Amino acid sequence: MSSLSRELVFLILQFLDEEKFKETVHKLEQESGFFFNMKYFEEKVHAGEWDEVEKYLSGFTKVDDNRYSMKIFFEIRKQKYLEALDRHDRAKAVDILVKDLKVFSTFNEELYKEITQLLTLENFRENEQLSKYGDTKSARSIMLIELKKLIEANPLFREKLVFPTLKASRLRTLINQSLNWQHQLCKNKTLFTDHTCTP
Template sequence: MCVCGKSMSSLNIELVFIILQFLGEENYKDAVHALERESGFFFNMLYFEEIVLKGEWDNVEKYLLGFMKLDSNKYSMKIFFEIRKQKYLEALDRNERANANDILMKDLRVFSSFNEDIFKELTQLLALDNFR
């Protein structure tokens, strides 16, 4: 049986579920989410929604990377682009120009070859005093 590109026997799948259940019952939340991510077996939508709503963009991306690669398909690329764009816009909103520039150059630049116009528009936002 193949789960998210990882080969797992039915016994291993059962063990992962038992371990996830135990960790959850013992309130080891970080361990639960690490096992979900590292096994690529169980995507916890409630946890994912929680970290998205909190704006924990690095954790959002790290969690997703346990289930898909940035370049898995056009949809995964779009998802990662939107996460990084949101992170960039929030840095601009907080007037953290240096941080926003780092995000633009390190995180968003990889998408420039797919849509140069959007990357140029995002770059132009740095020059504005208030991008709203």
């Protein structure tokens, strides 16, 4: 995965963006892990698509890579848990608590217990530290701000947050150059095979 190879991906990213292949752009972002699209991450957070959010994140970091990463996954999963409590889906809330939040219990036993106990409140805002929680829309925006600091501060996201300035259609431009080089033999088609000039 050399620097030239990695730069080819950015060129592909640009090309995909120009053809309006949106999902492909973000899958490529995620699977290559070369560029974290902060703007895309925001949209998905506001939309509360938490599965997509974590899946995208996993292209860049794991929960225990460092404490910035672990604080990021925690805030996401905490918000997910609270939203379930707020719609009174207790069953889903319990599922989130065992499947997503337990990994954090080893690191703070008392915090996990306190999180667990919110299940038995009729409204979780009765808890002092959550008392100022607004509605769903309000909580996501607030948490999004905290997610950004964590990401921007995170060592693993350092040089992945700004897309290089490029001239439009750069990949296409490189392809024209390669086509001209096949005509270098100039005695006067396709991209799949080299052009063969008739002599």
